[PDB]
Write an enzyme that holds these catalytic residues in place. Structure first.
Site, PDB file in Angstrom:
ATOM      1  N   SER A  34       0.468  -1.469  -0.198  1.00 40.08           N
ATOM      2  CA  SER A  34       0.282  -0.014   0.005  1.00 40.08           C
ATOM      3  C   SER A  34       0.974   1.020   0.167  1.00 40.08           C
ATOM      4  O   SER A  34      -0.166   2.377  -0.113  1.00 40.08           O
ATOM      5  CB  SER A  34      -1.225  -0.077   0.860  1.00 40.08           C
ATOM      6  OG  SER A  34       0.140  -0.221   2.256  1.00 40.08           O
ATOM      7  N   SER A  35       1.998   1.425   0.116  1.00 39.95           N
ATOM      8  CA  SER A  35       2.850   2.511   0.850  1.00 39.95           C
ATOM      9  C   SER A  35       3.080   2.666  -1.062  1.00 39.95           C
ATOM     10  O   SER A  35       4.322   3.098  -1.357  1.00 39.95           O
ATOM     11  CB  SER A  35       3.595   1.946   1.322  1.00 39.95           C
ATOM     12  OG  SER A  35       3.820   2.076   2.424  1.00 39.95           O
TER      13      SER A  35
ATOM     14  N   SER B  94       3.864  -4.231   3.236  1.00 37.36           N
ATOM     15  CA  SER B  94       3.733  -2.727   1.855  1.00 37.36           C
ATOM     16  C   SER B  94       4.503  -1.151   2.240  1.00 37.36           C
ATOM     17  O   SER B  94       4.057  -0.557   1.532  1.00 37.36           O
ATOM     18  CB  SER B  94       2.314  -2.307   2.923  1.00 37.36           C
ATOM     19  OG  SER B  94       0.825  -3.151   2.301  1.00 37.36           O
TER      20      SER B  94
END
Ligand code: PF7
Ligand code: PF7
Ligand code: CL
Lengths: 543, 541
Positions: free
Chosen positions: B184-185, B208
């Protein structure tokens, strides 16, 4: 239909008896060889001095060991605190690392610290005849640090009581008065250290179990932040309950002994055997620090009415700290009822007590657990119903009962988040006032045998800091006077419910018994907490 | 579905205005400074930038606005910026001079609270709900002289390793626009990886930080979960603690990660969040150059690695040997149980019901795949469907059965198992007397919208969220045409739909970066960084 359990009790007892007999013969033989040993000087030397004299070589380990072993056996006659003699300690004796910071020091161990070849029964039948396969991590460092663990000390059945009795080894008694409780669950330790039978020991604390018996028996204890020391290899009843952390810490006769014990434990051997403990060395600079403190305080938590003896202890300490140039600031953690009734109770009993109750199938339930087992066994609907009926008359009771019901994983997550938030709430309140440290009343004097189990609400002074996971320690500061004991007969309690009524009675006939004060710091601030305990000690018990 | 369209429109105009402000700002600066060498400024390593800032050779305005400009340009191709933190020019002039990050602009994953800005996480219900103060980590970056300047994009709800949401759209890999930047980053992967931030902060619960760093060709570290403070982070679920969230740095080299960590682990952090153990950065452990006993594996026997992943790993191994470290085969026991029962059970103990709340009314972005549709399924059908699947596709059956809601009693059991499992691997580790562990890292980047259908690929990273060991990632090589053609022989170990999606997704990836993963025991992030440095030095000097 309880035959496995009676079987257990007979073995446990025959083992205890044999342990105690081996001790006697060991010490009897030593004395024959060393009749000119000054046994009084040895036993009543403080630990720091005893430690230097071992280091300096002025005393041999055997001298200090067999002397203590003797005193242990003798105090046990009156207290029943020793469940077992850890029989291979004469090998560790001569093999004890000389450069160790605890070289020579006999240490007593609560029964739930795993030791190669011994039961950690916890008073449960089902843990008898099940020797630990190896020492736990903490015992391994103690041993690497030169110490000599030599006894397992009694605990209440399951460790979930602040009295100290079980159907295996029976009941431990307060060394100052055998009608009273030594506190618990680290009662064995309290009674032993408290009567001179050990110069240092180790206990666990998830709702006050290091601080309760420390206070009750007139000795010191620290409950560090939960993950400061390693719980690898410790025996318990429930596993995988992480809302309220178990914390393990030293119990000793003075504050400085707690400090040494922490520095010895907080070292590379610990951090390498248990990588999961954060490698936080003992900051001596902070311990040794001596600047004016901002000390928050409260006389009462508005939940458990203090005894007169407690509030005297707390005002007098406060007044001395002011005398000494510290700033004393009224302070009271917000929402204590929530903290005890919903957060702590809920995390301790998220599953309704099912996992815990398992330990009791087929076994007796010791009197000093009260109705805990009866109440946990009650189905969820009925816990809830009884709780609503109780609520208008006795709200505190209603609160607790209703929070001891089983939940969904979903509801646990919510609870654990609330615990995270409450912790931040209090830290913020704490910083709003820019406190360094927090002075608190401690339960005392000792309640009668078999009464803690019926006075649950008086866990308020200690359990709060398990909930918050703050370091918290207990030092003795005074003893109950005739005036204090008398004033107790007017004791009312805030709720007036069965728990306040029993407590009035359980603290009766207490003249002479030690009463304590409590010292709290922010998480990971053990060495500040210990610095502050040392000041209180210096002020209130100068000698 | 009106609320979801409204929130999208709002989100989009907020983003558009930020870019405008950014443009206006950089354009005014450039007029005043027409003779500044921005090519030289932007390509200096963080350590030299920082020293130049500290000497005074460079103004903080010079580096701030130069990086601000590059961020705007690279965003046109990547769509990585969700918001310009508009008050950072005040901060610019206030940044304390002694600060170890004095004058460094830093990018923030959207979920790090920032006074006055949303942490939408792509969810409509979070739009127009601005944060009211800075998270602890953002506070210490500021007390350390840094200048946080942008929020960067995340996939909807942060629970994907792609990077798209119905609000701010879809972020792209700056190396190839058909490829995902990971997540997600992801925003931070795209931004840092194209030269638009010298340092950024991300979070990692199952990979992530590590995915986007690998996919975008930069460095990242997921520390031990409680090394840094998560006070102030926006999330979808709270009080799940079986598998820990960890936050950590992303950057172009390992030294950047080390400096950042040295900057965060200081008294300001420990005072602001007392719940974090006050362990300072042990500079001596990081700087040490003693030979290392390096545990290693070439495959977790769960996710078949890409040819590029394999070569990367063996080439690295071989150089470390060449440099005289001892290389020892090592595979944590019971990976399949660790992923299927422990990690999945930990993340979805409640059937995904808390998670699902966040989607009530919103569109579900395509890059989540069918996660949402799967969780909306009632327990008894999850169990029935799992039974059908089990004989031909056990992995699938295994995950599905473990995403079912349980009791608190059952969560205690699972929690206890995670603890035992963590100790079992520490025991393996010590039996072979390892210092550090070298593993593969997923790569090269999957095509847009394929990660959300290749959940099995999570194995390389998530193992170490489960175990809560520090894990970081360093780019070591790039996919060759030989590597890429070979994907045509990739089959998977299970042959299930995850293996089929993954196969296809890793194709057409010539020229893309491929990382290696470094692991160390809990609280050993400086040793882990010491190992990451060595791998950087040997493979990419
Ligand atoms: C030591 O850490 N202990 C032993 C004493 C115990 C006190 C206690 C007993 N019963 C209940 C029931 C419900 C909630 C809380 C308590 C606490 C705490 C743990
Ligand atoms: C970052 O830490 N992330 C983003 C990616 C996400 C991947 C994931 C998706 N779905 C499932 C279902 C069951 C088990 C595990 C996962 C992982 C991990 C966290
Ligand atoms: Cl921790």
């Amino acid at each position: 239909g309880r035959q496995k359990a009676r079987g257990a009790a007979t073995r446990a007892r025959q083992k205890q008896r044999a342990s105690l007999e081996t001790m006697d013969k060991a010490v009897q033989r030593f004395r024959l060889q060393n009749p000119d040993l000054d046994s009084e000087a040895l036993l009543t030397l403080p630990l720091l001095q005893l430690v230097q004299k071992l280091q300096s070589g002025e005393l041999s380990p055997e001298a200090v060991f067999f002397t203590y072993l003797g005193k242990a056996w003798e105090v046990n006659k009156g207290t029943n605190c020793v469940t077992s003699y850890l029989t291979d300690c004469e090998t560790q004796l001569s093999q004890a690392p000389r450069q160790g910071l605890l070289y020579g020091v006999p240490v007593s161990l609560k029964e739930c610290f795993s030791y190669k070849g011994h039961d950690s029964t916890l008073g449960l039948s089902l843990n008898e005849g099940m020797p630990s396969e190896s020492d736990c991590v903490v015992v391994q460092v103690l041993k690497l640090q030169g110490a000599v663990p030599f006894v397992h000390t009694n605990v209440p059945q399951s460790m979930f009581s602040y009295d100290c009795s079980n159907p295996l080894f029976g009941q431990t008694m307060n060394p100052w008065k055998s009608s009273k409780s030594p506190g618990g669950s680290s009662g064995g330790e309290g009674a032993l250290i408290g009567s001179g039978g050990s110069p240092l020991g180790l206990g666990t604390d998830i709702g006050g179990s290091i601080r309760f018996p420390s206070a009750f028996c007139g000795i010191c204890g620290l409950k560090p932040t939960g993950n400061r020391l390693s719980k690898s290899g410790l025996k318990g009843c429930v596993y995988g309950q992480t809302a309220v952390q178990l914390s393990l810490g030293p119990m000793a006769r003075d504050v400085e002994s707690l400090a040494l014990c922490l520095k010895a434990l907080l070292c590379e051997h610990l951090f390498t055997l248990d990588p999961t403990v954060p490698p936080l060395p003992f900051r001596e600079e902070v311990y040794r620090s001596s600047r004016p403190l901002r000390v928050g305080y409260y006389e009462t938590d508005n939940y458990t009415m203090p005894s007169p003896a407690m509030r005297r202890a707390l005002i007098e300490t406060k007044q001395r700290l002011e005398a000494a140039g510290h700033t004393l600031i009224p302070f009271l953690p917000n929402n204590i009822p929530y903290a005890l009734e919903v957060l702590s109770t809920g995390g301790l009993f998220s599953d309704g007590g099912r996992s815990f109750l398992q330990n009791f199938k087929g076994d007796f339930v010791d009197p000093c657990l009260g109705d805990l087992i009866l109440i946990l066994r009650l189905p969820s609907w009925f816990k809830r119903l009884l709780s609503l009926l109780l609520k208008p008359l006795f709200p505190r009771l209603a609160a607790f009962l209703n929070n001891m019901r089983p939940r969904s994983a979903e509801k646990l997550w919510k609870l654990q988040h609330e615990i995270e938030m409450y912790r931040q709430s209090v830290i913020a309140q704490w910083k709003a006032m820019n406190l360094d440290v927090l002075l608190t009343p401690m339960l005392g004097p000792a309640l009668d045998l078999n009464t803690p189990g019926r006075a649950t609400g008086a866990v308020s002074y200690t359990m709060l800091y398990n909930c918050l996971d703050f370091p918290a320690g207990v030092v003795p500061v005074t003893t109950v006077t005739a005036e204090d004991d008398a004033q107790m007969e007017l004791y009312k309690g805030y709720f007036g419910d069965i728990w306040d009524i029993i407590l009035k009675k359980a603290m009766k006939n207490s003249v002479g018994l030690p009463v304590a004060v409590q010292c709290v710091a922010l998480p990971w601030q053990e060495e500040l907490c210990l610095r502050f305990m040392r000041e209180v000690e210096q002020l209130m018990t100068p000698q």
